[PDB]
DNA sequence: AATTGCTGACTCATAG
DNA sequence: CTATGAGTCAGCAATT
């Protein structure tokens, strides 16, 4: 964590009695944390654009269901002027 | 060497099971496409024969 | 350069 | 058994 969190600068100011081997353990522990980090990111932003689509899905499908009800509607008025029209040419 | 087999058998499975998350974003995407394809040809339609009725109401009232 | 962030693949543990 | 969750590293490209 705050192996993490620290800036390098700071971070050498912790390292200054550490051996080289030490150094280079230390480091390769804080890119491994980091890591760790990066894949939970990395999975978490998939999780939330699969949701995302999911729900755009099923807010699409209920726009399209009410649209196709309008239309119907509206085609039977417009058919319901057209037999009466061809009822006059009759 | 039941070791060995058991990681080819769970790599070729981890393959599959990332192909497969992919496809799946793939055709839930194309999925959502095809409604706002679908709620934009409703759109259209509906001002059409807002246009059609309203020209024949018209049309039958003026005669 | 060294460090950082990301994502594909491999692995272990375990869910299904 | 295989499918998945999550930690790890490989390797690239951006940043400091």
């Known amino acids: 964590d705050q192996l993490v969190s620290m800036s390098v600068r700071e971070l050498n100011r912790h390292l200054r009695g550490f051996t080289k081997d030490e150094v280079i353990r230390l480091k390769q522990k804080r890119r491994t944390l980091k890591n760790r980090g990066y894949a939970q990111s990395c999975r978490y932003k998939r999780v939330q654009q699969k949701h995302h689509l999911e729900n755009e899905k099923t807010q699409l499908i209920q726009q399209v269901e009410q649209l196709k009800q309008e239309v119907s509607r509206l085609a039977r008025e417009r058919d319901a002027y057209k037999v009466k029209s061809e009822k006059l040419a009759n | ?63």
């Open chain 2, 1 to 63: 060497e039941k070791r060995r087999i058991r990681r080819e058998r769970n790599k070729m499975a981890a393959a599959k099971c990332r192909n497969r998350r992919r496809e799946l974003t793939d055709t839930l995407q194309a999925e959502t496409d095809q409604l706002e394809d679908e709620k934009s040809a409703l759109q259209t339609e509906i001002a059409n024969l807002l246009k059609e009725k309203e020209k024949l109401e018209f049309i039958l009232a003026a005669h």
